[PDB]
Each structure stands twice: as structure tokens, then as C-alpha cells.
Design a protein around this ligand. Sequence first.
Ligand code: NI
Length: 341
Amino acid sequence: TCPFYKKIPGTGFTVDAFQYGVVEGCTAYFLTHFHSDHYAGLSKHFTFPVYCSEITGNLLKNKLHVQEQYIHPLPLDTECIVNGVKVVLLDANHCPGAVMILFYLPNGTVILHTGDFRADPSMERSLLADQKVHMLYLDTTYCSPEYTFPSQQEVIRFAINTAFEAVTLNPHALVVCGTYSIGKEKVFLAIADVLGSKVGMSQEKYKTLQCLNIPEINSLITTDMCSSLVHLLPMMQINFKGLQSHLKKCGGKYNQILAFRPTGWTHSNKFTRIADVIPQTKGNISIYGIPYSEHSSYLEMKRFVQWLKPQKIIPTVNVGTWKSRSTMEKYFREWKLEAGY
Ligand code: NI
């Protein structure tokens, strides 16, 4: 049964709740972004409205094959009416097409649902700047002060430099990047751009990227592997046995892979900086981990919530145990007491 934190009070609206069957009372199903935990359940056989971003729309039509009529895309940053409820979609700074949703209730309550987000000061000069928000449904993925990680721009700097070094030292080395969903496209695109290449990938990954309205994308990617010295692979495949295997297939065209695993937080964030990163090495293959996050750090989250001063906070992540629930509330109280709301 759909949990209470996936429902919006005083509406027939639900948020990312596609995996329970029909939810009695729901007139409309919002989808925040195209990631399989959030969309789990959709198919070609859905005949209720889905509201989402244009980009999420394209992925629903082209990857899951939902029928064009039931996909209602909405522009961002635009006051829109949806069954006589004002809603706005805002960029969530997560993966491509990912949104937060502002709900303006009939009664006068205003609710913000973040979806998955990486909180940023640019959001403090958006449409949220204009009015009071009473309820916040919050992405709590990293709600604990251990969770620090660098800025995305720091990581992209590191990556660009590493790859450009090696390729210039050894012109027969291949760059590889791991992936399993949308998001983190800037990693492979920034690398490929510094190296004067297109990114090569499988047919299904090419199809996925062609839905994202990336500008000039036809110049940036290809399905021709031979012609490309930055390749993408399944994240499962990014290891020695799988990279060896793949290094065979290229047929004596490269003598060294230099791979990147963009990951989230790992425990090596607690003791090591980004400028002082190393890879594992089994011969001619060297695998970098790089903590490129598309979720709020503890401090970024803190700052956003303390600016917003919401009257009530409802967590959407790590709610499955009482210990996590209890721990999170403690931080919510400290924030509110420090800030005086
Ligand atoms: Ni996500």
C-alpha cells in the first residue's frame, strides 16, 4: 500500500508511486525523474495521466513505450493548472529531466516535494523566493554530517586533467567510464571534449542519450566504437576481468584502459581529498573511483532547509527503519533551533 509520504494532502495527486497498482483516489501520477526506484511499475499499459518534465516524457515514450496521450509533459518555471490545482516544476539539479514540484493547495497550504535533488544556492533565487512553504517532502539520502563530498566542478577538473595527461603520455590508451542510469553525463562529455573525440557506446545507451535534449548531441556521441577513444560501459562491467575482456574486443587498437567509476559517497571520503585520489591497478588497467554526487551533501541540505524555514519536514529517503527516522529528526530540530524558525 502506497505510503503516506508519497501522497499529497487535499489533492488526488501522488508522487513517484507507480508500484502499488491503482491508488484509490489518485487522479494524477507525478514522476519526478527517470530512475527505476521512482518509476518501478510503469509500462505501455498505463492509462492514467502521468505528469512529468518533457525530458522524462521522451524517456517514458521511447524507453518504456507509454502512449503519447497519457504523458503530460510540462515546462519548467511556469505556473500551470492541473485538475484545478496550481503546480510548478523546478530543476532539481539531479539527473537530466529531474524536477522538484511546488503544489499550491485550495486551502492555502503550499507544499514542496524535492524528489531527488542536489541543493544549490541558485534555487534561493528561483520561484521559491516569492512565498512561504509549509510542508517539505525532502530527499534525505545524505542526512548525516559524515556525508561530505566535493563540488561537481572540482571533480570534472580532476577528470579532465587525469585523462588528458595519460592520453598525451600514451596516445594508444583508451578512456572508459562506468554507468547504469541517466545522470553524470558531464563526466564522459567533459573528458571526450578535452580529448577531441565523440563518446562511443552501445545502441541502447545511445538511444537513452538521444532523448535528453542535450544541445549539439549528434556531434558528441556515436555507436561506432572503433572511431572513438572514450567508451561507456555498464557499471557491472567496470572491473579487471570485464575490462580485460573488453580490451580484447577492441582488437589491438589500444594498449591501456584508463577507467573512471563515478560513485556516490564511499567511506574513503572520510579520510582522502579529491586532489589526492588513486586507482587500483592489475597490470595495464587502472580504475579510478571519483565521488561525483547528484544528491545534496549534509551541509548543502542544511543550508537549503534553513533558508526555506518550512513549518514541517517529511523525509522520503532512509525512512525504512526507526533508527534512521529518529536520527534524522534530531538534525531537523538542531537546524530549526539554530536558525530560529
Ligand atoms: Ni535518483
